[PDB]
Symmetry: D3
Subunit: 244 residues, 6 copies
């Protein structure tokens, strides 16, 4: 297939304009190693230029979505660590959150802290009732890494954010949905199907418009109303120009 064999820790399947992306260390519950961070940068930069990819789905192999950063690795370690950090950032949110194409997280199982940044950076998100979530950094004796805290701060109310961050307790899919972490939670049985219907629906939209709408909305969150009058019109006009 188009990309079969291109990466060791990640696989990509194109189907009807959908680039399904699977994180591919099922035996390590798809933990995010530096290898996998470097490959995921490449996968995103590659799919950005591939005109057969209209929408991405992010998912994980086996029963993990991801189980967070690769533990048995941080233990290892240092100007190198600077660049290891940047390459986690590069794919998890620097590219993904304001991606030029629509993104959806399809959360099939374990999502554990670290995995929350790229979850939140996806435009939308469906999970399984049977998925299981955790900000268990605290039990391993660290505070959430990367933009995990910020992912939560934009998404979950602080009463609920701080409980889960400070206690380390797990929560099920239904609960991720109550808290507004995902758009919805459906039986695993119906997950891939439901995600796909949505994926197809977004392919129906003018993709230069959808970009400006979705990526303009995200940035407008950080600006004042009076600043946004100017920003969001500049993005409306930009959209007009890049379409014709």
């Amino acid at each position: 297939s188009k990309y079969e064999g291109r990466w060791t820790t990640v696989k990509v399947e194109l189907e009807a304009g959908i680039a399904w992306v699977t994180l591919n260390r099922p035996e390590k519950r798809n933990a995010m190693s530096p290898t996998l961070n470097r490959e995921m940068v490449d996968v995103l930069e590659t799919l950005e230029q591939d005109a057969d990819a209209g929408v991405l789905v992010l998912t994980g192999a086996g029963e993990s979505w991801t189980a967070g950063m690769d533990l048995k690795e941080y233990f290892r370690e240092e100007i190198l660590q600077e660049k290891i950090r940047r390459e986690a950032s590069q794919w998890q949110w620097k590219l993904l959150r304001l991606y030029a194409k629509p993104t959806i997280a399809m959360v099939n199982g374990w999502c554990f802290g670290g995995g929350f940044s790229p979850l939140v950076a996806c435009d939308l998100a469906i999970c399984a009732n049977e998925a299981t979530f955790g900000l268990s950094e605290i039990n391993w004796g660290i505070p959430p890494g990367n933009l995990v805290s910020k992912a939560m701060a934009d998404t979950v109310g602080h009463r609920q954010s701080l409980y889960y961050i400070m206690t380390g307790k797990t929560f099920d899919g239904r609960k991720a949905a109550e808290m507004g972490l995902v758009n919805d939670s459906v039986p695993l049985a119906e997950l891939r199907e439901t995600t796909r219907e949505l994926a197809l629906n977004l392919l129906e939209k003018n993709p230069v418009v959808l970009r400006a709408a979705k990526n303009g909305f995200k940035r407008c969150r950080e600006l004042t109303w009076e600043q946004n009058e100017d920003y969001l019109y500049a993005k409306l006009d930009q959209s007009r120009l890049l379409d014709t």
Copy 2:
């Protein structure tokens, strides 16, 4: 009556200190034309100085609240367009959001993107279970206009905001309420009544205080705690001075 005949696209009725404002193009589902934007600036500046107006209700004629910006008009078109944009801003949020008197949106039917700015800029909002809402800019092939995105970003969680913005799907009143877009949703039958009870309740309050409370709260959202200690006390003291 006091203001009967003063505007072509908007009507105003005073009753017990309540300025009921009706957008008045029912045959165009109260779309917001430049004419109607210019008149609504005037209506707000006029009602600001009218001491018989203690609280405003914003509502629309017939079965529309508003159906958003006037389509068959944007198609038309350009230094003019600059000023057409400003005059939409002037009434929809520049005057309305930090209005000197309490404001309530009474959403009786269709509310479609564009109509969301002045909906959110109103201090409070009641809708009918039977009203119907949409950010269908995307199906017409544009991103939300004016401060629509920002209206949503301050009001609805991003999972839900982006679904509705990116898909274009409609939602009913009950759902606007779940998402915190309105204070509540009641049968159309009871709407005008329920709105009025609330309107009367706000008339009971010292209006220089209510201003400082409501308009100070809105602005405090953009400031840090440490900045707000100084801002909100300056607004408390201001309130004291402008009252006696």
Copy 3:
């Protein structure tokens, strides 16, 4: 006991690493007088250095949590008033909100505006179904004082925030929970018990980590994603250093 007799308006009990703090003017429904503000600064600075205190609970004597600022006192009054204001700030949020140790509000009864700042500045919060809440500043003819508005703006959606601020209406514990003001609401009967279980659970955590996690999360709310990559890593590294 360790601190018996140290303050006139506040009492402190240590038990299993928990500093239970009781506001202690039950006959004035624990209103917050300048005396009580000065003592609460001292109580927080004192408990910060006491290594037998791992977590704080904030609660009030009798049937009040607090009934807000001391009315019969503001009536009294002025460069003095400057310093009276600062000392309310000092304990209610300047020290409490980014406190070095975990904090929990245990809301046993009346909480009325003013009491909302230190409620929200606590990391977490449990209330009784039978507690009763109000932003009734408006009926007394003032806008919320201190950081009350801001407390609400960070916690409750604006539809709901502004209703309660502008109307002055009361709400019960169950409702504080719906609005995300508290983590949960339980019968008064089970309150002290439920709070304690949680308090013990947080004592199990590395306290230099918990600090950086909880106090880093709060501050990340005010920063952009790109700013937070640098901030939250600096806080991760800080945490590493202050632990060993």
Copy 4:
């Protein structure tokens, strides 16, 4: 003339694309009254749509630019929320991000409230002879409207706070040292230097010049990382508006 007789407190002479706008209450040192505020809103809004108007220059009749807001009026409610708003509407809400280039030509006394539209103008030329101060403090009031912020955005905080705190005056040469103006030239050559520059700005594609100047001013409020998005959005917006 086009505009001759249209405004009681303001006078507007079009000449070679330039729109010379003269504050016209010299009997009051052009003090900024509620009347002069409303008219100025109109003037700006009229000149925005006048295609014979490429640049604006703002200057004062006589030996006065303006001596600030009208003290006689100050003296005394909801009506005050409007008069403030009208002061703002022209002195910076419209002026600072105006659709066309703007220059302040400061011929004489510029005190207090006058600093806002001074700063709000894209560029500014004064006279060696012109004299400024922030006298609000001597009148027993703190700088009003956006004056403080005008100062904060352009003058170093040590110098800013000397003049706000003492209310001492300064002349055109000091104005230039501080960064409050582009240059200070003898009153003699002031109209000439302003005209030269105004002519230069007319050479430029008007839509581009808009994006350039109005994008730069906003870009101060934004971080680099936010600005990558904003300024590129203004680039494309600029391209879209050309024909």
Copy 5:
């Protein structure tokens, strides 16, 4: 005297409304120790409520302003969260938005941590002879507390970063070029120039001067559009607090 003997590391002479506040460990070049921090909090809090105190001047005993934080102490936990907080409490949390005007009178060496309360003061006068540097870098540590931000807010980033990165020193004349002070005058006339100015600030309505200076400093953090609300709120607040 009123305050004579009240503080071990600080000395406070009231004279004609002026409150001369002297950092008083000249044997240590007035190095800012945890003791001197706690006392300074008290001093500021005491002088806030003293109605005979209209202005403050902050200066150092001997030939030293301060040579920064106390290196002997630095050397070594939760207690560190307090000592930092106390350093902050006086050097800017209270000082920078102090209820009364504040002037730094810089008589001698001013290094490192000393720059925060330098900047935090509304105004500042130094001596030609006084010498400054940001030597933290030579000690193998980056500027501490709010030092960086002191520099960011007042000195251009090229100059700011030369001195933070190299740790080179500079004298009073350079200080003034950069905008770090209001002026640099021979040590001879330093006490005189400071007194003159201090006297001028006493002429002013105290409540108004507060609103004016403390509003200006905050207005830097805000946009124009936000500032319309903030500064008018400080205007009215100012009016309300007068009698």
Copy 6:
């Protein structure tokens, strides 16, 4: 040599810890093309991990620093989202908060897009002879990428807007007046002055210097009250990374 032949548009000579980095299309006045962008990303990323590299200097081959972005290319979509991103990636995303000290050594013409990596460098030395302008306006486009913001962060808004609006050029002496560089010295002594300073920066603990310079730059975006948390977090972070 280590890097000799590794890059087609850029040349990198290591000498005594210093990493002289030369933009190397002198036939095009080192115009910044998509090729030179990609290579520059690589160069920076390579030099970050090279332990023989302590400082960087960025300079241009011939009598040109760079004359900005490559106009021949500009001319013509999703691919444009990448080429912009690559321009950004090196000119400020990596450079401005680079792990090692950075100096711009400006030997010749510096126009337009070149101002971003100019500003983004921690420090900068130019030649009396070198010539700059913001000519985008004459080309019928507004400053691109982060140029505006480069200017907003370092040059006073009056001067910033003169040069953005008119597109007039200026020489090395003006550059220094405005705060765009640290100094302007005869081309003759330029390499010497740059080397001296570069040598000085190598004296410093590298990890500390990082925290110091990169903390200072970020601290501009933050308020004092936020900065108390941020900068102390960078202090401790700095201590943690030393051995």
